Amino acid sequence: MAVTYNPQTKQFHLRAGKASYVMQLFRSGYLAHIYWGKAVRDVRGSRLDRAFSPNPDPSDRTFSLDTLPQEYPAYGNTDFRSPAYQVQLENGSTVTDLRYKTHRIYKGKPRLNGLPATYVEHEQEAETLEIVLGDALIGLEVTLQYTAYEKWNVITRAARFENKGGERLKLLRALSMSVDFPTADYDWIHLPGAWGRERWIERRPLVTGVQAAESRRGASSHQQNPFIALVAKNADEHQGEVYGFSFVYSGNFLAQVEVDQFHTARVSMGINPFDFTWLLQPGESFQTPEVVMVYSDQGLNGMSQTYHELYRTRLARGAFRDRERPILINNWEATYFDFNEEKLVNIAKTEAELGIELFVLDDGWFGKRDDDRRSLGDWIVNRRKLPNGLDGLAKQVNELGMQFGLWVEPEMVSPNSELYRKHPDWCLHVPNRPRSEGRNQLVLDYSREDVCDYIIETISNVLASAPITYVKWDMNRHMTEIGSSALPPERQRETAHRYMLGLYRVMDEMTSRFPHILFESCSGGGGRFDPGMLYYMPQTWTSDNTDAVSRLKIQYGTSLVYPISAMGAHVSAVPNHQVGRVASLKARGHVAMSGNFGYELDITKLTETEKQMIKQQVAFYKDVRRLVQFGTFYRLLSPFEGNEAAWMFVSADRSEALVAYFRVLAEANAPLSYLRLKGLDPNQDYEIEGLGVYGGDELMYAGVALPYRSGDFISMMWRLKAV
Amino acid sequence: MAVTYNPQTKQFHLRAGKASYVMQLFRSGYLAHIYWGKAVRDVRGSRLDRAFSPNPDPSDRTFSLDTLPQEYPAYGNTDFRSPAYQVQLENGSTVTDLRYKTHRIYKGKPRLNGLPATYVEHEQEAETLEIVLGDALIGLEVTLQYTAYEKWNVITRAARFENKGGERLKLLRALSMSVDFPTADYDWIHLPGAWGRERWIERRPLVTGVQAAESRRGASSHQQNPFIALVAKNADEHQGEVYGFSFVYSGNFLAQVEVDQFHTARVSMGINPFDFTWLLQPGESFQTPEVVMVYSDQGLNGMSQTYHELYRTRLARGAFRDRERPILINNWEATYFDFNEEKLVNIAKTEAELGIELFVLDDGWFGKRDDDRRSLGDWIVNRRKLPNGLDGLAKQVNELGMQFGLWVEPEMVSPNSELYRKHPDWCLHVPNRPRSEGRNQLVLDYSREDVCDYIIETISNVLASAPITYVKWDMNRHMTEIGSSALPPERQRETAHRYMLGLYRVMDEMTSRFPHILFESCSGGGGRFDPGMLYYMPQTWTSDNTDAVSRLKIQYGTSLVYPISAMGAHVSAVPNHQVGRVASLKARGHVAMSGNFGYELDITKLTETEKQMIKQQVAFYKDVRRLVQFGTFYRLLSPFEGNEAAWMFVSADRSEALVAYFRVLAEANAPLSYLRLKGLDPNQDYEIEGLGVYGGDELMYAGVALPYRSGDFISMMWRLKAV
C-alpha cells in the first residue's frame, strides 16, 4: 500500500504486502525499472554503454534505451527490444519519445473506464501512483497507473493514452505493462490447453529470444490462458521466488518474455497487438486493461493463495461474492433437447430429495432451438415446450425447495433466426466475404450499441419473467472475419476490442439488473476463464471435460490463478464422453468436490445405491463447502509431474482441513506412498476421520502413510479437525 | 531436382538430393503441407474437425484452416495460428482468401528481383515449381516459389505478391515461407549472440506457444543470426533428423516456431513484420527474399555440410568463389589512426618476408577521419597522410610481393562531414526528431537512388585509383529513427527494406565494377554474417573478438551454417582486448588457422622468435589452406557442451585431413582424453604427423589417445595423410 517518491533519489518505492517494486527517474526524464522482489527498506538505483546500442543523447554516450531497464519502452529511438507500445503518426513515422512530466500519489484504487479491474472497499486497502509521460512534439500523453495493495503482495498496472495534440495518432500496440528484469535466470510457466483440456501447467527454461502465449480468437481462449509467471530455477509449490502476471481481460492477449543479448528478461502483457489498432483523434483517450502482478518467495502456493484471496474478495463482485455457492444439477443429458414441462417437476422432486439445491434448465427452451443449429438470437420462450412459460416451471421447482436456473448464449445468432433475417448486418463480418460458422452460428457485433441494447432488452425480458436465481452465460465459438459495418475503415481493427467492451457493458448491466441471480460464465467450458470475466460473473464452468482423471490436470492448473470458489466441477455419468473412461462414483465425487460442486447427469438413470451415494456426497459437500470454497488451498502433488495429484483446504484459523489424494495406474506390489501436508499448526493435534489422531507437525514433516491400495484410479478424501 | 505433380492425387512431390518435400491440393483449392523428410517414393496425403476450430465452408464441416497443415496460411478465415502473410484492404479489413489457381514446373532456378538467391550454373542442377494462388475478390495473386536441388537435400522457398486488382493493398506481413510439421517433438536451435560473441549455439525444447529469434536492427545482427533449426530429440552432430531454415537476407528478420493446441509445429521465416508494411498499388508486385531449407538424417554435421557446399559454390559468386583466399594482415593496431607513407612500406617488406600475401590499409586514410568521429561519407584520399595517393603506396606494396587492400564504410555519414552539410536529408531520419548516433555517426538513406548513385560514384573513384585487390566493407551501427524524406507517409515503413534493396544494388554494382577485388563484408565483426551478404562478398569478418577461447564458440556456431571459406579468423596480439586473456601464439594460430586465416597486429612489436613462429604458421596454413577452406568440415566436440572443442577437415577423396583439438581449464592429474574422428575411409591407413600410423577405422571407432597435458589452454593440430 505504502507508495512513496523520494525527490532526492527520484525513486518511486511501491510497498505491496511483503514485496517492494521500485522505479527511478533517469537523466532527461526516462523512467527506469529498478527492483521487484521481497520488501526492502531501500535499494539504490552499470555498463549501459554497449557496442551497437546507440545513444539517444549525442551529448551523453553513457547509455542507450537498448540497455536501460524500463517500465514502458518504445522502439525506434535506440531501444531494439520488444516495445510496450507503438504509435504511427500521420507522416507515417512510428517514432515516439515519451518522457516523464509529473506524477501523483493517492489512496485507494481507481476504476478503469469501460473495464473490469481489481478494486478496494476502503481507501486504506491500497495506494495508487500515476506517472504522467509525454511526447511534447506530438502531444501524446501516457499515464502509467500503478496500485500497491496493503495486505497482499500485489502490484497492478495499466496505461492510459491521450492525444493532446492536433493530429491523428494510431496506436499499433498498447500493452498494459512491461518490466525489465536484470537477469533471465528463471523458468517461465504458462497455461496452454485446448477444449476439454484447459490450463495444463507448462514450465520451460527461457530462451535468448522471445517466448509467448497469446490468443487471436477474440476470447482469452482454451488454447492459452492469459497468465504467465517467471519462477526461480529451484522454486516449487512450497518455496522459492515466483512472479505472476495475470491479465484482467477476456479478449485477445499477448503475454511475452523477451530475453536480450545481455540476458535481461523483458516481460510484457496486454491486448494482442496482432490485428489490432486504435485510432485516437485529438482529445481522445485509450485505457488498457490491467495486469495483476504477484510476488512470492513461498513458491507457487504462495502466489496462488494471493491471487485466490485478491480475486475472490476484490475482483469478483455482487451478492454472492462471499457466499457459499449452490450445489446444482444441470438437466441437459436427461433430455439433450427432448423436453416438456411434465418430466421436469418430478425430476426436481427426486433431485430435491437428494439434497441438491439448484435446478438448471439447459439449451433449447427458446424459439426453434433444437440442435446446435437454430434460433440463437431469438430469446423468447418457445411456448410449445413450456406453455406455462418459465414462471410455472420455476415456481413449482421453488415449492420443491430448489432454486431455478437457466442457460443463455446471447453473443450468438443463427443464420436461420428472425434476428438474422431482420438485421443481417448485426453480425461480425467484413464486406463481400463468406461468413464462416462455428457450430452453425455467427457472432453478434457487440461493438454496436444497437446490438447491445437489443440483447440487454431481450435477455432482461426473459430473466424478469420468472423467479430465476442462476444463469449460465455460454459462448460457443471464436471470432472470424472480424469487422463491423458500423465502424469506418480506419477503425476496423478496433472491432475485437470494442466487441469486448460491448460485452462488458452488457454483462455489467445484466448483473446489476438482476442482483438475485448468481451468474456463471461459460465458453465451451473454460474458454474464457480469466479475471476479466470473474469481475462480472463470480464463477465459471471450468471445462466441458468432466472425466475424473482429466479434471485432475485441469483443476490443478486452473487453481494456479483462480479461486476454488469460481471453479465449477461437476459429477457426470460414465462412459465418459470426451475421453472414454470409467472411474467410481466415489472418485468423480472426490475430484468434483474439490471445486465448486455440482452435477451433470440424468437422474432418471440412477440406481438406488447410486442416488444413495449422491445423497451422501451432497451431505458431505455441504459439510465442507465453506472450507473448499473459502479456505486456503494448497497444492501438494502435481499430476504434471507424475501419476499422483494431491491438494488440501485449510480453514482460516487452521482448526479444520480437507485433504484429497489421487493416483492413476497404481502398479501391483507397489512401494508404500506418503503424503506430507501443509498449512497446519504444528503444535496442534488433529483428528483425521478414519485414521486417528496426528500432530500437525507429524502430518507436515513426516506425512501420512497412505492406506496401501492398487488399481486404475485411487481416490481418497479426509476431513481433519483440531482435537 | 525432380519435381512432379500427380493430377490424380493432386500432390506435388519435390525430390531434393535424398529428401522429399510433398504438398497436396485440398478441397476448394487449399494447399496442404504433407511431408518433409527422408526421400520416399510416395506418401499419401485425420480429425481436421476440432472444437472451436471453425469451418470456412458451411457446407463442409470436415475441416478448419485452424487445423489443416499449410504452405502459406492466412489469419482471419478460420485459422487462428500465426499467419505467413497479412494484407489490409482499403476498407480496413484484413481478411484475404488465397486459393490455388494454377502452377508451372521448369528446369533450373530463377533469379529473384532485386535480391540475392542461391543459383544454378546448369539447368540440370535443380527444378523449380511455382504455385499461383489468388484471391479473386481483391485481385491479390501470390506465387509460391519452390526450388529442389538435384545434388543436395535443399528446398528453397520464396513468395511473390502481385496486385492484379484496382484497389490499394497494404502488406502488413510477407514472410518467405511457412511449414506445418505434424508433431512438435523436436528441440529448436538458433544462434543468439552479441558483439564480440556472435552465434552461440542455443538448443531448447519447444514450448506450446511461440518462440522466435528476430532482428529489428535493420541488419541481420550480432544478436540473432537468421538461422533456426528443428532437431530430433536425440539428434547430435553425427546422426539424427535435422531441418535447417536459413534466410538469404541481411536486414530485419523473424524466425519463428509456433506450436498449437494440437502440438503441430508451424515454422515460419521472412522479413520481420515488426515496423514493416509494403504498399502495392494496382499492377505492383513484391518479391520476398528466399529461405534455404535443408534436411539431414546425419545430424548437424550432415546439415552443415550441405549448407557449406551450397553456399560456397552456389551462393557466393565472382572470381574468388572457388579460389584459395589470401593470408592477410590488417595494419590498424600498428598505428590506430597514426599513419603516413614512410612506415607502411618497410612494414610491408617485413610482412612479405614472413610470407604474408595481402597488405590491408585500415580506417583513417580519408578526409579528416582521425577518430570514430569524423569525415565518414567524404571518400577522398586525405592527401596529407598519403601525398602520393593510394597508387604509390599500393604499387610499392605490390613490388614487395604482396597484394594491397583497403577498408571502406560507405553506409555511414558523419554529422561533421561535407556530405552531411550539403545533403543533411540524405540520412535515415524522421521529421522533427533527434537523429540518434551510433559511434558518432548517422546512417545514409540507401533507399534513395541519389544516395546510392553517389556512393557508387565515390567509392569507384577510389577503387579505380590504385591496384587494389581486396576491400573490407564495414558497417558499424544499427538503424534508428527509420524513415526517408523521399518516401510518402504511406510508404515510410518500407524504408528499412528499401534500404537493404539499395545496399544490394550498390554492392552488386561495386563487385561487378571491380572483378579483381576480393570483397569481405564486415559489421563490427559478424553483425551481418548471413547468406544475403555472402552472395555479394564471398567472405566475412566473423567477429571483432579475436580471443582464442572466445573464438572457439564463435567459430563453432558460425560453422553451423556458413562455409569455412567465408569465415575470417585472425591471430591478434595479447593482452586480448574484448576479454583479457593470454594464450600461446601457437594456440591463437591453431584457432585462426581453422578459419579463413589472417593477422591483426603490429609487426613492429614482435620478437624474432615470434616472427619465426608466424613465418611457420604462414607456411603451415599455405600447406593446409585448400583443405581448410574447401574440405569437408566435421565438428567433433562442442565448447557449448563442456571445456573441449574439436573439429576436422577432410579432402574430397578422403586421402588427407587436418584435425584440431582444444581444451580449456584442464585440471591437474586428469583422466586421459580421447578423440574419435569422422569422415575417413575406414579401410585406409593414415599417417598422423607426430603420432604414427593408424587405420581410418581405428581413428573413428576407437579414437586417438590424446597426448596427456594440463594447463589453462591446450591446443593441438595434426595433419593426416593416407599411407
Coordinates of N, CA and C in Angstrom, one line a residue, chain B residues 219-299:
Chain B
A219 N 19.6 -4.7 -39.8 CA 20.7 -5.6 -40.2 C 20.4 -6.9 -39.5
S220 N 20.9 -8.0 -40.1 CA 20.6 -9.3 -39.6 C 21.0 -9.5 -38.1
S221 N 22.2 -8.9 -37.8 CA 22.6 -8.6 -36.4 C 23.6 -9.5 -35.7
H222 N 24.3 -9.0 -34.7 CA 25.1 -9.9 -33.9 C 24.2 -10.6 -32.9
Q223 N 23.1 -10.1 -32.6 CA 22.2 -10.5 -31.5 C 21.4 -11.8 -31.8
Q224 N 21.1 -12.0 -33.1 CA 20.4 -13.2 -33.6 C 20.8 -13.4 -35.0
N225 N 21.4 -14.5 -35.3 CA 21.6 -14.8 -36.7 C 20.3 -15.4 -37.4
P226 N 20.1 -15.0 -38.7 CA 18.9 -15.5 -39.3 C 19.0 -17.0 -39.7
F227 N 19.0 -17.8 -38.7 CA 19.0 -19.3 -38.9 C 18.3 -19.9 -37.7
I228 N 17.4 -20.8 -38.0 CA 16.9 -21.7 -36.9 C 16.8 -23.1 -37.4
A229 N 16.8 -24.1 -36.5 CA 16.6 -25.5 -37.0 C 15.7 -26.2 -36.0
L230 N 15.0 -27.2 -36.5 CA 14.3 -28.2 -35.7 C 15.1 -29.4 -35.7
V231 N 15.4 -30.0 -34.6 CA 16.2 -31.2 -34.5 C 15.5 -32.3 -33.6
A232 N 15.6 -33.5 -34.0 CA 15.1 -34.6 -33.3 C 15.6 -34.6 -31.9
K233 N 14.9 -35.1 -30.9 CA 15.3 -35.0 -29.5 C 16.7 -35.6 -29.2
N234 N 17.0 -36.7 -30.0 CA 18.2 -37.4 -29.8 C 19.3 -37.1 -30.8
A235 N 19.0 -36.2 -31.7 CA 19.9 -35.9 -32.8 C 21.1 -35.2 -32.2
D236 N 22.3 -35.4 -32.9 CA 23.5 -34.7 -32.4 C 24.3 -34.3 -33.6
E237 N 25.6 -34.2 -33.5 CA 26.5 -33.8 -34.6 C 26.5 -34.8 -35.7
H238 N 26.3 -36.1 -35.4 CA 26.6 -37.2 -36.3 C 25.5 -38.0 -36.8
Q239 N 24.3 -37.9 -36.1 CA 23.2 -38.7 -36.5 C 21.9 -38.0 -36.2
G240 N 20.8 -38.4 -36.8 CA 19.5 -37.9 -36.4 C 18.9 -36.8 -37.3
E241 N 17.6 -36.7 -37.2 CA 16.9 -35.7 -38.1 C 17.1 -34.3 -37.8
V242 N 17.4 -33.5 -38.8 CA 17.7 -32.0 -38.6 C 17.0 -31.3 -39.8
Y243 N 16.3 -30.3 -39.5 CA 15.7 -29.4 -40.5 C 16.2 -28.0 -40.3
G244 N 17.0 -27.5 -41.2 CA 17.5 -26.1 -41.1 C 16.8 -25.1 -41.9
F245 N 16.7 -23.9 -41.4 CA 16.0 -22.8 -42.1 C 16.9 -21.6 -42.1
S246 N 17.4 -21.2 -43.3 CA 18.4 -20.1 -43.4 C 17.9 -19.1 -44.3
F247 N 17.8 -17.8 -43.8 CA 17.2 -16.7 -44.6 C 18.2 -16.0 -45.4
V248 N 18.1 -15.9 -46.7 CA 19.0 -15.2 -47.5 C 18.7 -13.8 -47.6
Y249 N 19.0 -13.1 -46.5 CA 18.6 -11.7 -46.4 C 19.4 -11.0 -45.3
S250 N 19.7 -9.8 -45.4 CA 20.7 -9.1 -44.5 C 20.1 -8.0 -43.6
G251 N 18.7 -7.9 -43.7 CA 18.1 -6.9 -42.9 C 17.3 -7.5 -41.8
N252 N 16.2 -6.8 -41.4 CA 15.3 -7.3 -40.4 C 14.7 -8.7 -40.7
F253 N 14.6 -9.6 -39.7 CA 14.0 -10.9 -39.9 C 13.3 -11.3 -38.7
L254 N 12.3 -12.3 -39.0 CA 11.7 -13.0 -38.0 C 11.9 -14.5 -38.3
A255 N 12.2 -15.3 -37.3 CA 12.4 -16.7 -37.5 C 11.6 -17.4 -36.3
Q256 N 10.5 -18.1 -36.6 CA 9.6 -18.4 -35.5 C 9.1 -19.8 -35.6
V257 N 8.9 -20.4 -34.4 CA 8.2 -21.7 -34.4 C 7.0 -21.5 -33.5
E258 N 5.8 -21.7 -34.0 CA 4.6 -21.6 -33.1 C 4.0 -23.0 -33.0
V259 N 3.9 -23.5 -31.8 CA 3.3 -24.8 -31.6 C 1.8 -24.6 -31.1
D260 N 0.9 -25.3 -31.8 CA -0.5 -25.0 -31.4 C -1.1 -26.1 -30.5
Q261 N -2.4 -26.0 -30.2 CA -3.0 -26.8 -29.2 C -2.9 -28.3 -29.6
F262 N -2.7 -28.6 -30.9 CA -2.7 -30.0 -31.3 C -1.2 -30.4 -31.5
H263 N -0.3 -29.7 -30.9 CA 1.1 -30.0 -30.9 C 1.7 -30.2 -32.3
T264 N 1.2 -29.4 -33.2 CA 1.9 -29.3 -34.6 C 2.7 -28.0 -34.5
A265 N 3.9 -28.1 -35.2 CA 4.8 -27.0 -35.2 C 4.8 -26.2 -36.5
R266 N 4.5 -25.0 -36.4 CA 4.5 -24.1 -37.6 C 5.8 -23.3 -37.6
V267 N 6.6 -23.6 -38.6 CA 7.9 -22.8 -38.7 C 7.8 -21.8 -39.8
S268 N 8.1 -20.6 -39.5 CA 8.0 -19.5 -40.5 C 9.2 -18.6 -40.4
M269 N 9.5 -17.9 -41.5 CA 10.7 -17.1 -41.5 C 10.5 -16.1 -42.7
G270 N 11.0 -14.9 -42.5 CA 11.0 -13.9 -43.5 C 11.3 -12.5 -42.9
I271 N 11.1 -11.5 -43.7 CA 11.3 -10.1 -43.3 C 10.5 -9.9 -42.0
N272 N 11.1 -9.3 -41.0 CA 10.3 -9.1 -39.8 C 9.1 -8.2 -40.0
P273 N 7.9 -8.7 -39.7 CA 6.7 -7.9 -39.9 C 6.7 -6.7 -39.0
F274 N 7.5 -6.7 -37.9 CA 7.5 -5.6 -37.0 C 8.0 -4.3 -37.6
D275 N 7.2 -3.2 -37.5 CA 7.6 -1.9 -38.1 C 7.7 -2.0 -39.6
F276 N 7.1 -3.0 -40.3 CA 7.1 -3.2 -41.7 C 5.8 -3.1 -42.3
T277 N 5.6 -2.4 -43.5 CA 4.5 -2.6 -44.3 C 5.0 -2.4 -45.8
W278 N 4.2 -2.9 -46.7 CA 4.6 -2.7 -48.1 C 3.3 -2.4 -48.9
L279 N 3.3 -1.2 -49.5 CA 2.1 -0.8 -50.3 C 2.2 -1.3 -51.7
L280 N 1.2 -2.0 -52.2 CA 1.1 -2.4 -53.6 C 0.0 -1.7 -54.2
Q281 N 0.3 -0.7 -55.1 CA -0.7 -0.1 -56.0 C -1.1 -1.1 -57.0
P282 N -2.2 -0.8 -57.7 CA -2.6 -1.8 -58.8 C -1.4 -2.0 -59.7
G283 N -1.2 -3.2 -60.1 CA -0.1 -3.5 -61.0 C 1.3 -3.7 -60.4
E284 N 1.4 -3.5 -59.1 CA 2.7 -3.6 -58.4 C 2.9 -5.0 -57.8
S285 N 4.2 -5.3 -57.6 CA 4.5 -6.6 -57.1 C 5.5 -6.5 -55.9
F286 N 5.6 -7.6 -55.1 CA 6.6 -7.6 -54.0 C 7.2 -9.1 -54.0
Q287 N 8.5 -9.1 -54.1 CA 9.2 -10.4 -54.1 C 9.9 -10.6 -52.7
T288 N 9.6 -11.6 -51.9 CA 10.2 -11.9 -50.7 C 11.6 -12.4 -51.0
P289 N 12.6 -12.2 -50.0 CA 13.8 -13.0 -50.1 C 13.5 -14.5 -49.9
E290 N 14.5 -15.3 -50.2 CA 14.3 -16.8 -50.1 C 14.8 -17.3 -48.8
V291 N 14.2 -18.5 -48.4 CA 14.7 -19.3 -47.3 C 15.2 -20.6 -47.8
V292 N 16.4 -21.0 -47.3 CA 17.0 -22.2 -47.8 C 16.8 -23.3 -46.8
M293 N 16.1 -24.3 -47.1 CA 15.6 -25.3 -46.2 C 16.4 -26.6 -46.4
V294 N 17.1 -27.1 -45.4 CA 17.9 -28.3 -45.5 C 17.5 -29.4 -44.6
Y295 N 17.4 -30.6 -45.1 CA 17.1 -31.8 -44.3 C 18.3 -32.7 -44.2
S296 N 18.6 -33.3 -43.1 CA 19.6 -34.3 -42.9 C 19.1 -35.3 -41.9
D297 N 19.4 -36.6 -42.1 CA 19.3 -37.6 -41.1 C 20.6 -38.0 -40.5
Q298 N 21.6 -37.2 -40.9 CA 23.0 -37.5 -40.5 C 23.5 -36.4 -39.5
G299 N 22.5 -35.9 -38.7 CA 22.9 -35.0 -37.6 C 23.3 -33.6 -38.2

